[PDB]
Write an enzyme that holds these catalytic residues in place. Structure first.
Site, PDB file in Angstrom:
ATOM      1  N   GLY B 370       0.824  -1.191   0.000  1.00 39.63           N
ATOM      2  CA  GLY B 370       0.000   0.000   0.000  1.00 39.63           C
ATOM      3  C   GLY B 370       0.864   1.248   0.000  1.00 39.63           C
ATOM      4  N   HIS B 398       6.212  -4.651   2.151  1.00 46.13           N
ATOM      5  CA  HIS B 398       6.803  -3.880   1.063  1.00 46.13           C
ATOM      6  C   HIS B 398       7.327  -2.579   1.652  1.00 46.13           C
ATOM      7  CE1 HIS B 398       6.923  -0.821  -2.069  1.00 46.13           C
ATOM      8  NE2 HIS B 398       7.059  -1.781  -2.965  1.00 46.13           N
ATOM      9  N   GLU B 401      11.636   1.040  -0.527  1.00 44.72           N
ATOM     10  CA  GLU B 401      11.646   1.798  -1.775  1.00 44.72           C
ATOM     11  C   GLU B 401      11.788   3.292  -1.511  1.00 44.72           C
ATOM     12  OE1 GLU B 401       8.226   1.204  -4.364  1.00 44.72           O
ATOM     13  OE2 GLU B 401       9.555   0.264  -5.836  1.00 44.72           O
TER      14      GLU B 401
END
Ligand SMILES: [Mg+2]
Ligand SMILES: [Mg+2]
Lengths: 590, 538
Positions: B370, B398, B401
């Site tokens: 998300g 996740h 990044e």
């Protein structure tokens, strides 16, 4: 070199094979049936012209030719015995099969491919000569063909049966045990098919590759001792407890005046094979002659460490992790602080490792484990002291015998489930250490959940009651969490099959088939009175039906679960692979 | 049960061997040379008397007998080829050796030892019978005798040469090739290298595919070339991170109906099999697909997905064709302020869905993908994850990044994430490198995703269990084979060994049961063995 041959109707195929090597051959030994169609006189006159070539003749007494099952098996066992007797000690014998009918030729071929031969081959001539004046021009014209199918190493090490089975040239079929028959009868589950660790284990001939799958037996002592093993749960204080080790450590004390030589732990009938189960309190009591009351002496500490390292090397161990309690051995009167004790032990182990490596001998790389005990009689600040000491030792940095992590252990009477001592364990993970936890030795299956999920402990001690919490099994399995477990110690202090008046079964086999990364350890060597080899071997009567390959995968799991760096893991894995390959190749040569 | 025997000049062996076993056999194959001396009529009529069993005759073309080295080697090669085209698929066969002269007897025994056999034996008759009635008569009197030798297991890896060449459409001397000689030389060279050297002898760091020829291993040690596309396409692969809704790029606006979801699932399965991938994990968004006005709950959508996936798996398995096992991951879109209860709804849906139990396809973990932000850190949703681990689920993440390293740290330690997504800047925190190393936390990183210097090589050197994935196939417009292909030019100096290491790390980091992981390891090992053994020739 030595060549062997067997022939039937043909009489002098051996001279034809004697020209297989242009340089020549050195020794000739022919074994065949008692049939009269073979002519020994012709071979005698042929080999009498070459006195430098040894010519020994043996025949299958009492068997002219193979006619039924009994004759075939009798001839097979005699030619086996002759083959074990006659090969060179260090060189594979030469052998040819250009003569003889299907039975003996096939038997000799199978024996050669099972033991090994320098070169098996075939010799055929276009004109099938009858006399020497014919095969002379047969080889001169090149009609004789030197048919060779390929090199046949066989099992590079199987001829120990030459000595373990007495050499008996004169005997019959009435007394022989084909150990090979038992090793061949049952060979071909998914597990034993693909749980093969140490990739070179795919290289051994199918005989050894399947022998590894046979159930483990008590007669496997030398082989199990010759394996490189790993111990991950070892208490240094329980190494020397009685006997010559106790005398040596006592005599190495700086001041022997204050050495209590009067105390003596009582004997247990059949120890380490306890005749009955024992309580924990007496188990610690047997170690009362040693521990911290005697190890305060610096000389005693050095002697104990050196003796422990020597015993570990003697047990063929290649890597180990030692649980230590530096605070317990500190003494402010002699300026012996806990940090000084840990530094001294680190330097001693590093010096031993360096001196063993410089001689290119076998050495067991060793790393330490600090013990943050339950701290009986209150005073829980020592927990923080121990963690601070471990952190300082870890960013000490330079050296070889490094500190890898901390250990939490102690009595289960306090009912500590990693929650009482959780208040300070947060900081250790930031530095980069590793955490174990002696959890659920006889306690509820609840504490281990926080022990793995809040403490982030990568290893568990014992946890023998895990079988009754399948939910805990599943989450332990997915997280790749090691389980240290001590066979002899748990057997003594809890009781397991097959000692009388008990029905509890050792949970090891189910732990393996489930997939739990269980690593077998020895805990307290002196008190239990059993090294790593005996602990591994006791699984035969501890968990029936276990195979040697489960032991191999146990060793592999022990490699996997050790708190060590990646590159050191690759190097240790390579060394273990080569060493274990050589061991299964040569030690089980029996 | 299959009987294999050699035919020389007499029809002695075959019928007595066939009747030697009290139960009898079902398939019998006999090998012979081009010699006209042998006759096939007696065996033909005898087996025609009992047509229930199978029978065949193989003749070595252009070779009546063995007269020199070339003749014998050719006969041995054709005998080995006839044998390998005639192993039963699973069980070991029985062998009778008493046929032919001692040369082919020894060759057949060598074949049995090499490839393994159930129970080889000998057959001898004192009276040398000739015609069927008195073979039967002599068997009545008990003059028949079977001489059992043993039970050779053989080289398990050496039963796998049927793939390279079952038969060369009747090869001639002009185009003959000694492939079985290649097999024997490769195995003897492997054994001799093991026994002689030590530096090469000990390295062996992989799943016991050590039995390839040394030339094959040297080729593997060579770096990737851009021309290995066929090889990587042929290797079985694993895709641990694939989004279902991004294939036909769709999603919320189009997929609200039922038939569209079915065709999307079927298309994804067909493409996934098309790349020979054996296992994959799929992250889906059930809430994004529910339609209350149509009485289409998110649970209904997820159940439909599971049902169609398991139906397709069963259909593929029933055909015995290659199939790809697929498990589902329930995403938890980090919608932040909007409908904060959506997170709890998604996790509760995952716990309820994983308990359906029956079905080859199931839910094995949840996802934390998300909108990533400092406020969206792991220390914000952690109140809701106290029970996902209680029920035995799995969690991925996740981060890295655009987030911060301490966010990764808390995700690893507070969420206890078994896996991790991306986090390409992990080099800048060596402490985090150590933490991810010793805890064996996998990393899911998709080279095309970051493409749209790459540090993956350094990740293999350090020891991250790095898994290469497709992320979303459609928007990226490339499959996982293409993703592996980009590593050649994208990362110079990458060796073909590291591709297999990536595959192995991927199969270790899959949220799968122990037995399922074991089966997948076996199947993957066999498949990679076969594919490399085939591809080394070309
Ligand atoms: Mg202990
Ligand atoms: Mg993605």
């Amino acid at each position: 070199r030595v060549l062997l041959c067997s022939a039937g109707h043909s009489s002098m195929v051996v001279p034809e094979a004697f020209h297989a090597v242009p340089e020549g051959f050195e020794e000739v030994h022919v074994f065949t049936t008692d049939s009269e169609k073979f002519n020994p006189v012709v071979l005698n006159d042929f080999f009498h012209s070459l006195p430098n070539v040894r010519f020994s003749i043996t025949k299958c007494h009492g068997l002219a030719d193979i006619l039924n099952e009994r004759d075939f098996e009798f001839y097979q066992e005699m030619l086996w015995q002759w083959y074990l007797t006659k090969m060179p000690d260090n060189e594979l014998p030469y052998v040819c099969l250009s003569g003889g009918i299907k039975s003996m030729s096939a038997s000799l071929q199978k024996a050669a491919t099972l033991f090994g031969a320098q070169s098996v081959f075939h010799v055929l001539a276009d004109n099938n000569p009858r006399n020497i004046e014919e095969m002379f021009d047969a080889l001169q014209k090149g009609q004789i063909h030197f048919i060779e199918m390929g090199y046949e190493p066989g099992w590079a090490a199987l001829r120990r049966l030459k000595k373990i089975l007495p050499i008996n040239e004169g005997c019959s079929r009435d007394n022989f045990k084909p150990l090979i028959s038992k090793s061949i009868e049952e060979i071909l589950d998914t597990g034993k098919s693909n749980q093969l660790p140490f990739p070179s284990l795919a290289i051994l001939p199918p005989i050894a590759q399947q022998w590894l799958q046979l159930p483990l037996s008590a007669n496997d002592g030398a082989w199990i001792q010759n394996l490189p093993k790993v111990d991950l749960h070892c208490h240094l204080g329980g190494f020397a407890t009685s006997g010559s080790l106790l005398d040596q450590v006592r005599g190495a004390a700086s001041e022997p005046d204050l050495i209590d030589r009067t105390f003596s732990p009582q004997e247990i009938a059949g120890w380490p094979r306890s005749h009955k189960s024992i309580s924990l309190d007496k188990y610690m009591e047997l170690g009362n002659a040693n521990g911290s009351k005697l190890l305060k002496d610096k000389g005693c500490l050095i002697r104990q460490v050196e003796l422990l390292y020597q015993s570990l090397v003697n047990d063929n161990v290649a890597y180990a992790e030692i649980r230590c309690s530096p605070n317990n051995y500190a003494d402010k009167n002699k300026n012996r602080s806990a940090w000084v004790v840990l530094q001294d032990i680190n330097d001693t182990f590093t010096r031993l490792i360096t001196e063993a490596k410089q001689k290119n001998q076998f050495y067991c790389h060793v790393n330490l484990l600090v013990i943050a005990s339950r701290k009986f009689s209150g005073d829980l600040s020592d927990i923080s002291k121990h963690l601070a000491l471990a952190i300082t030792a870890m960013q000490q940095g330079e050296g070889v015998c490094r500190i890898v992590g901390v250990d939490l252990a102690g009595f289960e009477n306090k009912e500590t489930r990693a929650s009482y001592y959780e208040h300070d364990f947060k900081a250790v993970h930031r530095c980069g250490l590793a955490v174990t936890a002696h959890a659920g030795e006889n306690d509820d299956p609840e504490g281990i959940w926080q022990a793995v999920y809040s403490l982030h402990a990568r290893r568990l001690g014992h946890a023998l009651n895990l079988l009754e919490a399948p939910d805990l099994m599943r989450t332990v399995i997915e997280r790749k969490i090691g389980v240290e477990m001590c066979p002899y110690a748990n057997y003594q202090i809890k009781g397991f099959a097959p000692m009388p008046n008990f029905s509890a079964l050792y949970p090891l086999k189910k732990y393996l088939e489930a997939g739990i990364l269980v690593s077998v350890n020895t805990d307290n060597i002196g008190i239990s009175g059993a090294n790593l080899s005996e602990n591994l071997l006791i699984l035969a009567d501890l968990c029936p039906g276990i195979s040697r390959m489960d032991v191999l995968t146990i060793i592999r799991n022990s490699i996997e679960t050790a708190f060590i760096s990646h590159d050191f893991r690759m190097e240790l894995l390579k060394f273990f692979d080569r060493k274990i390959y050589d061991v299964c190749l040569i030690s089980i040569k029996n």
